[PDB]
């Protein structure tokens, strides 16, 4: 149980985003429906008022949080993958349209799942503005916790792959455009019961074994990271 209090650029916390430039659930329940339209953004996909300023090549960070802003984040049964996918403000999540700027499941050194790093960042985690077309743009982080996905919610809904899932609004003022951005994958859509990584059993397989869902990360992707990059308590 988890959700995105707002967002830093280049280290300078832009400010409370909760119904403001991130379109917020109204709790922190799992989405788990792959079929259902709360898949795109959430239970309340809206146009909310604003979208944070960004250029191509700034640092975008994400800060998630449980209960309070900086509290315990989520919990750490949510052991799972990470990614963020991008899609213009024009589809409003609809159709064909989001590319995926960043995955990260599990890292084999330090035998942490992206999960378990986000919490050790104080939820936060980033990705760096791609060199696409100045415009308004929606930068959904998806979490996607398997402490139940040995089911399938299909067959049984008590259990199943959990999706927590954030849209934000960014708008993307200065960029040369070098790499514009392609046509996507849809959500709801992409992810369907017998693709991977969707069900699988941490408790009895091993976590090097896991394979992510797809889509694979796009080329003009420049990375990101998980990772502290402010302090939320000097505020
Ligand atoms: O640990 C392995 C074991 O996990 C089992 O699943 C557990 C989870 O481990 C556990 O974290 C989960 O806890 C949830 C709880 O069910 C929710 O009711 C609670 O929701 C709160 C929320 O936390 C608050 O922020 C909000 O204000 O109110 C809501 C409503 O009360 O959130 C916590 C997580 O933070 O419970 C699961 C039980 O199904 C698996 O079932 C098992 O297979 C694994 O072996
Ligand atoms: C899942 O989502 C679809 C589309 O909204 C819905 O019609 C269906 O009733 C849902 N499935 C379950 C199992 O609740
Ligand atoms: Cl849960
Ligand atoms: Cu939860």
Known sequence: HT???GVWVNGVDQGDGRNIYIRSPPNNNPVKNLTSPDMTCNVDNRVVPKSVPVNAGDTLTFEWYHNTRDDDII???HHGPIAVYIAPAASNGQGNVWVKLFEDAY???????????????????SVVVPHVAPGDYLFRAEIIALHEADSLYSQNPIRGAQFYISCAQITINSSDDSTP???GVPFPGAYTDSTPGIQFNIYTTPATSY???????????????????????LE
């Open 3 to 5: 959700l995105v209090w």
């Open 75 to 77: 919990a750490s049964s």
């Open 107 to 125: 890292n084999v050194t330090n035998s942490t799942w992206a999960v378990d790093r986000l919490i050790t960042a104080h939820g936060q985690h």
């Open 181 to 183: 951005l392609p046509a």
């Open 211 to 233: 394979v992510a869902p797809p889509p694979s990360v796009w080329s003009g992707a420049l990375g990101g990271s998980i990772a502290q990059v402010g302090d939320a308590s």
